[PDB]
Amino acid sequence: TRPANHRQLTFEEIAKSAKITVNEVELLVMKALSVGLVKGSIDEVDKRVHMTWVQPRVLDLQQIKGMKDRLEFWCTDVKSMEMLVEHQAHDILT
């Protein structure tokens, strides 16, 4: 659910979502790290979890348009840098 930016989440959020108290949540994430479902690292003194990689999943046809738009405004940066580098260093060889 959370975006790639600001993926850090707290213990109390897990406690409320999973309907358990705090003292077990570590073990839960431990299990989630053991079987390789999710990859990350966990802190204890500050009650924070740093989540990094989660398994992919299937999704409908109205969600891939987001990836299409992301490619849309991704290709333009490459094109712009191409043009800038080509024009700036022209006389180095015609």
């Binding site: 790639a4 992919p56 891939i64 348009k65 990836m67 490619l71 490459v78 191409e82 580098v85 060889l93």
Partner: protein, 286 residues
């Protein structure tokens, strides 16, 4: 199984002139031939090749004709002149792979259990390599079939031998690199990389456009790989990354500073030497 394949220019020239001499007769679309080469470790080398009579109908993709006796006797005939070569696979000059490729590969897998398919483009228009290398394999998934035959790509490159190198050097009189230095290190590496990356992104754009409006055969492995791609982009706004970047750049510039200083000193020395040596030449004429 196979890691890299190396292709000599001889087979490229043979492909080109075979295509020319067989397409001049009539309007054929695809031609087929068999390659010869060698193995060492996991690296494959291709040396030479010869053609073979092949026929295919555009009406249906399930009818085609090859010659067995021709291939057998021609291999036997090339055996008597050089015994080091051996059958390794085949090539077809189609712009893109066809449906019948699996059937032909199965047909001539008899002569080589590790046949490798090679596609050569006869009229390239870009800077990419003209050759593509594929190998058969059996793939397994959840439902539909326990195994299915599928091609997988293998890295290819163009090699050269000493005699071949001197021949191609004699043939390429007109075109030769201007300078070797930062020029060839920059344009031949960076701008071409931008070109290729943009082309790849455009192709994947096209495929994604084909979905959710048109045909729509939603495939899931492509989606998984797209998620993996879009998840692996690094973040360059982090403070520690910026600090490390600045530290390394500042560390690197001092060396260029020093080298420029040395060059200036050497230039001054050369100027002094020339002026002193040349001022003592006018009085000798009297």
């Amino acid at each position: 199984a196979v890691q890299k394949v190396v292709v000599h220019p001889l087979v490229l020239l043979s492909v080109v002139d075979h295509f020319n001499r067989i397409g001049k007769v009539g309007n054929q679309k695809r031609v087929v031939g068999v390659l010869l080469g060698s193995w060492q470790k996991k690296v494959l080398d291709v040396s030479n090749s010869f053609a073979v009579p092949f026929d295919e109908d555009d009406k249906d993709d399930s009818v085609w004709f090859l010659d067995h006796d021709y291939l057998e006797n021609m291999y036997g005939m090339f055996k008597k002149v050089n015994a080091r070569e051996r059958i390794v696979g085949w090539y077809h000059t189609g712009p893109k792979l066809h449906k019948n490729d699996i059937a032909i590969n199965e047909l001539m897998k008899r002569y080589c259990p590790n046949s490798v398919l090679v596609i050569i483009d006869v009229k390239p228009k870009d800077l990419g390599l003209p050759t593509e290398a594929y190998i058969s394999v059996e793939e397994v998934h959840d439902d539909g079939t326990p195994t299915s035959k599928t091609f997988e790509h293998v890295t290819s490159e163009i090699g050269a031998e000493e005699a071949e190198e001197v021949g191609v050097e004699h043939l390429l009189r007109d075109i030769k690199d201007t300078t070797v230095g930062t020029l060839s290190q920059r344009i031949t590496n960076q701008v071409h990389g931008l070109k290729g990356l943009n082309s790849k992104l455009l192709d994947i754009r096209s495929y994604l456009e084909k979905v959710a409006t048109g045909k729509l055969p939603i495939n899931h492995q492509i989606i998984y790989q797209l998620q993996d791609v879009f998840n692996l982009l690094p973040d360059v706004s982090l403070q520690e990354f910026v600090k490390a970047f600045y530290l390394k750049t500042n560390d690197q510039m001092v060396v260029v500073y020093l080298a420029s200083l040395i060059r200036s000193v050497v230039a001054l020395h050369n100027l002094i030497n020339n002026k002193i040596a040349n001022r003592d030449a006018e009085k000798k004429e009297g």
